[PDB]
Design a protein around this ligand. Structure first.
Ligand SMILES: Cc1cc(NC(=O)[C@H](c2ccccc2)N2CCCc3ccccc32)no1
Lengths: 234, 129
């Protein structure tokens, strides 16, 4: 009975479907500690989450060391050369400064929690790595990969053609204001709410809205096709 | 009462199924049949999308109703808000630039990528079928 359970736990099939059960633990227990008020000291549900990060950190340190290259510089550098490994590291460091801020008195607590909420962003995203072990989920995760850079270049078109109307609208509809900074933030958030927005003086707001039509139909349809070719080859 | 109401709601769900049944008939017509088979293929592909979408959108949801509503006690219905409220919050709006970072990345993948991913996948389904 001993040699059986000993063998069984060391199986790689098990280590997948046990670590992820530990981990659906983390993505349930963390969503219960930032979606409730905290208090001056860590609650027990937060102590388990805190311990999850730290025990992950000491396991990261095992791969930092026990990797094949012998000199410590290269020993680190190869682990640092894998992309998902570094974004583990920076988010561990973020959760560590999360608990440094979450340990002092307010307004320190106010910060700690924001740093907590940006970590729940990363650890959800981590699933991507692991959802590429499925034969079905695998191609999707990877096509987000290829499409990401295409979208990084599309926003170069998008800002040039849509901040166009974001500035002109505040250069016409908005009055004569001096560097207000909030205005800089208005020029690209009024389009986020363009849905709720409508001699010749009514000429100009009509011309701006209609090539806004031409531009956004052309653009939406533009991406409608640029991921189209790529989902064929992926 | 309360038996009648419950029975009416159950009859109302039987409406849904007894409309869906027609999909077996569509098979008879040479134009509706392929559309129905494409319903099935799109259904399975949509399931796998719901998994991925749930990861990305739920991440922004849990961040959102953490940062907004900055305080609560263990709430029986707050889970009912964390997906439904940002969905209906399409009109929904010193460190006041951090919340636009969450708002910024929220639609960065939810639509530009996830919604487009659906288009791609349903168009892929189309080609074989
Ligand atoms: C906190 C926290 C994160 C975490 N999980 C991982 O970051 C990751 C993993 C991801 C999905 C399923 C199972 C595990 N993981 C855990 C241990 C170090 C490691 C090494 C290589 C590959 C994955 C991996 N557990 O707690």
């Amino acid at each position: 009975l001993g040699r059986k359970i000993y063998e069984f736990y060391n199986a790689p099939i098990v280590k997948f479907w046990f670590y992820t059960l530990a981990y659906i633990g983390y993505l349930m227990l963390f969503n219960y500690i930032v979606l409730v008020k905290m208090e001056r000291w860590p609650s027990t549900q937060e102590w388990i989450v805190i311990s999850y990060i730290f025990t992950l950190g000491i396991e990261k340190m095992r791969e930092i060391l026990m990797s094949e290259p012998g000199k410590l510089l290269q020993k680190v550098k190869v682990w640092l050369q894998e992309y998902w490994n570094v974004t583990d590291l920076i988010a561990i460091l973020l959760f560590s400064v999360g608990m440094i801020l979450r340990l002092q008195d307010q307004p320190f607590r106010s910060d700690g929690r924001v740093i907590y909420c940006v970590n729940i962003i990363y650890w959800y995203i981590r699933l991507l790595d692991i959802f590429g072990v499925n034969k079905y989920l695998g191609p999707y995760v990877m096509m987000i990969g290829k499409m990401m850079i295409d979208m990084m270049y599309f926003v170069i078109i998008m800002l040039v053609v849509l901040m166009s109307f974001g500035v002109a609208r505040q250069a016409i509809l908005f009055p004569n204001e001096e560097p207000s900074w909030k205005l800089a933030k208005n020029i690209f958030y009024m389009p986020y709410w363009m849905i709720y927005g409508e001699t010749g003086a009514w000429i100009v707001p009509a011309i701006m809205a209609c090539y806004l039509l031409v531009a956004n139909i052309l653009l939406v349809n533009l991406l409608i096709a640029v991921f189209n070719n790529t989902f064929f080859e992926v």
